[PDB]
Every structure is written in structure tokens, then in C-alpha cells.
Amino acid sequence: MQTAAISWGTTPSIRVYTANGNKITERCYDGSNWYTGAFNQAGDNVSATCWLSGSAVHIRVYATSGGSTTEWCWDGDGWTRGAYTGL
Amino acid sequence: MQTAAISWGTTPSIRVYTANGNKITERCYDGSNWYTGAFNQAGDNVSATCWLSGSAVHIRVYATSGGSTTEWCWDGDGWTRGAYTGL
Amino acid sequence: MQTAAISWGTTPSIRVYTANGNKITERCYDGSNWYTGAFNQAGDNVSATCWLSGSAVHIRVYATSGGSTTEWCWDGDGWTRGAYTGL
Ligand SMILES: C[C@@H]1O[C@@H](O[C@H]2[C@H](O[C@H]3[C@H](O)[C@@H](O)[C@H](O)O[C@@H]3CO)O[C@H](CO)[C@H](O)[C@@H]2O[C@H]2O[C@H](CO)[C@H](O)[C@H](O)[C@H]2O)[C@@H](O)[C@H](O)[C@@H]1O
Ligand SMILES: C[C@@H]1O[C@@H](O[C@H]2[C@H](O[C@H]3[C@H](O)[C@@H](O)[C@H](O)O[C@@H]3CO)O[C@H](CO)[C@H](O)[C@@H]2O[C@H]2O[C@H](CO)[C@H](O)[C@H](O)[C@H]2O)[C@@H](O)[C@H](O)[C@@H]1O
Ligand SMILES: C[C@@H]1O[C@@H](O[C@@H]2[C@@H](O)[C@@H](O)[C@@H](CO)O[C@H]2O)[C@@H](O)[C@H](O)[C@@H]1O
Ligand SMILES: C[C@@H]1O[C@@H](O)[C@@H](O)[C@H](O)[C@@H]1O
Ligand SMILES: C[C@@H]1O[C@@H](O)[C@@H](O)[C@H](O)[C@@H]1O
Ligand SMILES: C[C@@H]1O[C@@H](O)[C@@H](O)[C@H](O)[C@@H]1O
């Protein structure tokens, strides 16, 4: 079991990603309760980074499964698969 | 032996958390010597994130101890337990 | 196989560090394609953080191998060992 954490704004919002048994899930905080995010993909290791473009949040999640890393992107309209490739 | 690293401010300040043999400890840099920080909690895995608000720094450290993630909060007066819960 | 991710600026730039087979390598995005960065150092675990001084990027990569963490710095003039020491 392995986690990644990011945050933004002043509230703040927090996202914590968890790799456990080859699935990555997301728990979210935006100032009230912790809830379950829409992020649900394969991998046994995860890292993440985020940035604001004005008020809009952008997140990149790096999900590693079987020796390969997939980038997942949030840009205000669901999780999309990104262009990242490895060595 | 696993690390998480965070930073803030113009200096910057840096914090590096290490999980080594089920304990998580902290080394700190504020613009001069590294020193050992107040953080000491149980875990084999650590992730962390931080933000500023009105010139004060807030840190959330996520400590995992087998099947369970525990949030630790720094808000300027000691490490307190946070509301984070997993899936 | 384990990763760390950082990002900066408006484009933004992203750097993803991957620890595998006791070597850490780096994949980079600056607004066009992904490329292989200059960073190449030993370690089985990796964490990273960064900040901008104006427009100038500073990166700190914490590479852990042999039960020991070495801080690697990017400050505009290649990758150098930093003053970080552990417990
Ligand atoms: C970043 C994103 O957050 C969640 O997505 C929901 C989104 O959260 C807002 C949040 O309310 C703000 O306070 C925060 O500053 O920004 C985030 C991102 O905009 O809020 C929108 C509504 O405005 C929507 O509820 C998003 O829901 C998504 O997840 C749902 C269930 O959790 C549904 O699956 C829906 O289809 C999704 O689009 C997280 O859910 C998400 O995974 C990201 O972490
Ligand atoms: C941070 C640094 O980035 C890469 O190094 C190159 C550096 O990248 C710029 C980038 O072009 C900008 O868009 C970005 O905003 O900032 C970074 C850092 O200034 O740019 C310089 C030229 O200004 C140079 O090309 C750096 O290349 C170095 O790595 C190369 C391999 O990809 C070659 O080895 C070259 O000889 C090196 O100077 C990363 O490669 C690097 O590891 C750092 O991550
Ligand atoms: C944010 C915290 O940093 C360190 O605490 C510092 C204290 O040790 C002391 O030096 C005061 C006085 O300026 O600064 C504090 O920031 C850590 O010890 C602590 O765990 C937090 O990381
Ligand atoms: C910032 C960029 O966003 C999307 O375009 C991804 O396809 C890229 O890999 C990068 O993450
Ligand atoms: C930003 C919030 O700070 C405290 O209230 C914690 O208990 C929450 O879980 C969250 O970390
Ligand atoms: C910001 C600082 O940069 C250099 O002076 C390093 O040697 C320190 O360890 C620290 O990372």
C-alpha cells in the first residue's frame, strides 16, 4: 500500500492517491468531507503533481503497472490518458 | 527506506520525510543547516503535501502502516491527527 | 519500479523520475514532446520537489540507495550533490 498526495488553493483541496493490490483509487477533500474520487485505474505505484491555471485545477497522475508508466490527466472534464512514455 | 519531499516560500523551506523500519522521521531546511524535525510517527510508507495561507504554512503527511493511512497535520502548533479515511 | 513527479510554471514543465534496477532516470515535458533528461544517478527510491526563483527553476531530487539518501540539485548548472544529511 503506497500513496501520493497533492493540494491546491487556500481551502485547500487535497487529493490522495492509493496504490494497493494493482488498483489506484483517489480520496478527495475540498473543505468538508473526505469522499471517493472518479480516478480508478491500474497500477501498483503512483505519483502525482498538479497546477492551477487561474482557478482551474490540472492534475497529472503517473500510474505504474508491469514495468510501464501511464499518465492520467485531469483538466476539468474527466480523467484522460496522457502522452507520457518512459525511457 | 522511502522518502517524500515538500517545499515552500522564497527561501525555500524544504521538508524530507523518511520511512525507515516502520518509523517516519523528518529532516528540515529553512535556509541554513539541516535539522531534525518534530515529526515522529509510525509507517513504512510516507507521502506529503503543503500550502500557504495568510503567510502561514500547513502540511499534511500521509503515513501508511500496512493496510492503513493516517493523516498528520501541521498548522503551526504541533502535529495533530486529521480526519482522512481510506476507501 | 517507482516514480516521483514535479511540475512548474505556466506551460507547465513536468519532470518524472523513475527508480528501477537501482538507477534513477528522468523524463521531461516542456510543452512539446516527452524527452529523456540529463538526470542519471543511483538509487532504488526517489522523491523530488521544486521551486522557481523568478523564472529560474530549482529542483531537489532525494535518491535513496544503500540505506542512505543523497540530495541532488538542479540550479541551472547541471546536477550537483547537495548538503542534505539524514538521521
Ligand atoms: C479534481 C477532481 O475533483 C473531483 O471532481 C469533481 C469536482 O471537484 C471539484 C471540487 O468540487 C472543487 O472544490 C475543486 O476545487 O475542484 C474540483 C475539480 O473541479 O467537482 C465537479 C463539480 O464542480 C464534479 O463533481 C467532479 O466530479 C467527478 O467525480 C464524480 C464522483 O466523485 C463523478 O464521477 C463525476 O463524473 C466526475 O466528473 C474528483 O471526483 C475527481 O476525480 C478529481 O479529483
Ligand atoms: C530542469 C532541467 O531540464 C532539462 O535540461 C535542459 C534545460 O531544460 C530547460 C527547458 O528547456 C525549459 O523549457 C524549462 O523551463 O527549464 C529547463 C531548465 O532551464 O534547458 C537547458 C537549456 O537552457 C538545457 O538544454 C538542459 O539540457 C540538459 O539535459 C539534456 C538532456 O535532455 C542534455 O544533457 C543537455 O546537455 C543538458 O544541458 C533536463 O534535461 C535536466 O535534467 C533538468 O531537468
Ligand atoms: C513546519 C515545521 O518545521 C519545523 O518546526 C520548526 C521549529 O523546529 C522551529 O525551528 C520553528 C521556529 O522558527 O520553526 C518551525 O517551522 C519542524 O520541526 C516541524 O515538524 C514542521 O516541519
Ligand atoms: C501538460 C501536458 O498535458 C497533456 O497534453 C499530456 O498529453 C502531456 O503528456 C502533458 O501532461
Ligand atoms: C485540510 C484539512 O485539515 C484538517 O481539518 C484535517 O482534519 C482534514 O482532514 C484536512 O487535512
Ligand atoms: C536549497 C539548498 O540548496 C543547496 O544550498 C543545498 O546544498 C541545500 O541542501 C538545499 O537543498
Describe this structure in words.
The PDB classes it as sugar binding protein. The entry lists the keywords sugar binding protein, cystic fibrosis, B-propeller, human histo-blood group. Three copies of one chain form a homotrimer. Chain A is mainly β. Chain A has a single domain, classed as Beta Barrel (Lipocalin). Chain A is built from no helices and eight strands. A four-stranded antiparallel sheet of chain A has the order 1-2-3-4, with no helix packed on it. A four-stranded antiparallel sheet of chain A has the order 5-6-7-8, with no helix packed on it. Chains in contact: A-B, A-C, B-C. The site of a molecule of 2 linked components (GAL-FUC) has 8 residues of chain B, from strand 3 and strand 4. A molecule of 4 linked components (BGC-GAL-FUC-GLA) binds next to strand 2, strand 3 and strand 4 of chain A.
